[PDB]
């Protein structure tokens, strides 16, 4: 034991486990930073059961959390109004040069990420770590993006204040002592999280969330595999295994090493006739992912398996076929418009051992959002996420727009047998979509790899309420990776493009859909949700080499007649499949001047001459 006093050795504040049964660079991670941020006490989780229990308990008797009394093991916890989302404007990555994490902007401020120096970024960290958890517990979270052991998964250990962010750990990865074994002295990225509130408290704590939002700072380091995060519960923000590390620090990583790591779900889809092929696919966030990935198909005899349904880790075989995996253990998924009707199969998910955030009580216990679609008994009435009453001829909503449950994917009626599988599913297509209410089809299918590439590179949708902006302001979302790309994106469109020059690659079909498209009142032409299943199908058939498509300037269409549409005889189907010269005329100039202004010299050749051709066939017209 060297040391003239007591070295580093913080076992006198441990309150579960054992810092001598660590990994030897583990134990100087929770060292080192028990002596920066001084913590009360050290909690080693293992992720039992018994763990579990007693952490729900404690914070219930804190305040911090409510058990909703209608179900098995359910939670709710109410933030501070400041803290509801991701912030992408304090979002950051630091590398040595600007350029490597984002191309420099023609005319100033870049949208494919914010970068910060070495220097701003160390005295950033030393206004706000120092001391921070004075008076808290220290949680050392050991766990894994992946399946547990699996040579492809990736494992963390996450030091967090917040025993909210314990709980929603346990669910969204595996975490526990059984990764630490499979860790043993192997490398594991280091996540620093706190809530930035050190007792006694130096601001007033409001809704007993405890939160900075004046210094939240959202850090991935990835030369030094770091992510650390400052001032935020926020899932997106404090959960450093989901955004944090499988999106920004894997994609840079996956850039490197031959793979990708992206925001998509992952889904198997299986025919009336028992066939069955795996899809993956990139909308931006709250765009329908986990509403498509778990869908109930209104078409008889079709069925979804749910794989994962919101990042996907995806690499080519020996055998040339994309191969994914969810690294994810559970879903983080936006409550509002989740009904029976529309995803039923959440509703069964998230019955018990679910984490609501922000989401209205019923005086039952139960939970309610708006598009709930059940009705309460009169005389039930609704606590508001506000902690306030609330009635339905009120002017805010009950539930925060951006309101999440977070539960086991475990749970899920129709998980994928594969969806634990070390080896991954292989990819037969991958889709791209988002919010547009004019001008782009429900479905279109690209000509080539380096077409599909380039739609995903022009992808735009409206503003949502999962960050920070407001209003439904269009806004280009690249891949759905905007807010998250973890190197520069002219680059990571360089990465896609070869793998078309990879020997034997089973190249997936591209697609991209439009769920949201409007008529001139403002009403959805299509209704979604399990009836999305018609354009599965369509799908399904072309990956099969069926002629039912039409070739258009933007990609390939349904034929008059493919879509089944039986039952959606109301659909309009002119306006709804429509193309217009004027509107593509518009969107390929705004496209040009976008990847001009934003991406310019890092711009790959192949995307240009996608443009090029895309502008080419609208003269057509
Ligand atoms: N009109 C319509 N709304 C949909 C459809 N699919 C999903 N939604 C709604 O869009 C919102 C977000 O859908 P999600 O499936 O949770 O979005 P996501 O892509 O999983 O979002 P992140 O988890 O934030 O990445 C919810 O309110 C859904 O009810 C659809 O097909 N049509
Ligand atoms: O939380 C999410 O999944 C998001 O914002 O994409
Ligand atoms: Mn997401
Ligand atoms: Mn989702
Ligand atoms: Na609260």
Not at 476 to 482: I, K, T, V
Not at 592 to 620: C, F, G, H, M
């Amino acid at each position: 034991p060297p040391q003239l006093h007591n070295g580093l050795d913080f076992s006198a504040k441990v309150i579960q486990g054992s810092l001598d049964s660590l990994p030897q660079e583990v134990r100087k991670f929770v060292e080192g930073n028990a002596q920066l941020c001084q913590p009360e006490y050290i909690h080693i989780c293992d992720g039992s059961e018994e763990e579990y229990g007693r952490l729900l308990a404690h914070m219930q008797e804190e305040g911090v959390i409510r058990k909703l009394k209608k179900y098995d093991n359910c939670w709710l916890a109410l933030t501070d109004p400041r803290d509801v989302a991701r912030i992408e404007s304090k979002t950051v990555i630091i590398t040595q040069e600007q350029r490597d994490t984002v191309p420099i902007p023609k005319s100033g401020q870049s949208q494919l990420g914010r970068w910060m120096s070495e220097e701003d970024f160390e005295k950033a960290f030393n206004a706000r770590f120092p001391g921070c958890m004075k008076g808290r517990t220290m949680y050392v979270i050991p766990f894994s993006m992946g399946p547990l052991g699996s040579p492809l998964a990736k494992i963390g250990i996450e030091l967090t204040d917040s025993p909210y962010v314990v709980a929603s750990m346990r669910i969204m990865t595996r975490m526990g002592t059984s990764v630490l074994e499979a860790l043993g002295d192997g490398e594991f990225i280091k996540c620093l999280h706190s809530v930035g509130c050190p007792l006694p408290l130096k601001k007033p704590l409001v809704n007993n969330w405890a939160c900075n939002p004046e210094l939240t700072l959202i850090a991935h380091l990835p030369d030094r595999r770091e992510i650390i995060s400052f001032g935020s519960g926020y899932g997106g923000n404090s959960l450093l295994g989901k955004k944090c590390f499988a999106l920004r620090i894997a994609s840079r990583l996956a850039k490197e090493e031959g793979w990708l790591a992206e925001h998509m779900l992952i889904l198997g889809i299986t025919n009336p006739e028992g066939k069955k092929k795996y899809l993956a696919a990139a909308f931006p966030s709250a765009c329908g992912k986990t509403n498509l990935a778990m869908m109930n198909p209104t078409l008889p005899g079709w069925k979804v398996e749910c794989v994962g349904d919101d990042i996907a880790w995806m690499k080519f075989d020996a055998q040339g076929n994309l191969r994914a995996i969810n690294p994810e253990n559970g879903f983080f998924g936006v409550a509002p418009g989740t009904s029976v009707k529309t995803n039923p199969n959440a509703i069964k998910t998230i019955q018990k051992n679910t984490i609501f955030t922000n989401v209205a009580e019923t005086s039952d216990g139960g939970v309610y959002w708006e598009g709930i679609d059940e009705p309460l008994a009169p005389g039930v009435t609704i606590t508001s996420w506000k902690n306030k009453e609330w009635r339905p001829q009120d002017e805010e909503p009950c539930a925060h727009p951006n309101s999440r449950f977070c539960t086991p994917a475990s749970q899920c009626p129709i998980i994928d047998p594969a969806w634990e599988s070390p080896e991954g599913v292989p990819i037969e297509g991958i889709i791209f979509g988002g919010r547009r209410p004019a001008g782009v089809p429900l479905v279109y299918e690209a000509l080539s790899w380096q077409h599909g590439v380039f739609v995903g590179a022009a992808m735009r949708s409206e503003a949502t309420a999962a960050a920070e902006h407001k209003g439904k302001v269009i806004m280009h979302d690249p891949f759905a990776m905007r807010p998250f790309f973890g190197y520069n994106f002219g680059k990571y469109l360089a990465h896609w493009l070869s793998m078309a020059h990879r020997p034997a690659a089973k190249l997936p079909k591209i697609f991209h859909v439009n769920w949201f498209r409007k008529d001139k009142n403002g009403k959805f032409l299509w209704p979604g949700f399990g009836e999305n299943s018609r354009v599965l199908e369509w799908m399904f058939g072309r990956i099969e080499g069926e002629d039912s498509a039409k070739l258009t300037p933007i990609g390939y269409v349904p034929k008059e007649d493919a879509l089944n549409l039986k039952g959606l005889g109301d659909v309009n189907v002119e306006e709804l499949f429509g193309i217009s010269k004027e509107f593509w005329e518009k969107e390929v100039e705004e496209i040009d001047k976008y990847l001009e202004d934003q991406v310019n010299a890092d711009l790959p050749y192949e995307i240009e001459r996608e443009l090029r051709a895309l502008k080419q066939r609208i003269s057509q017209m």
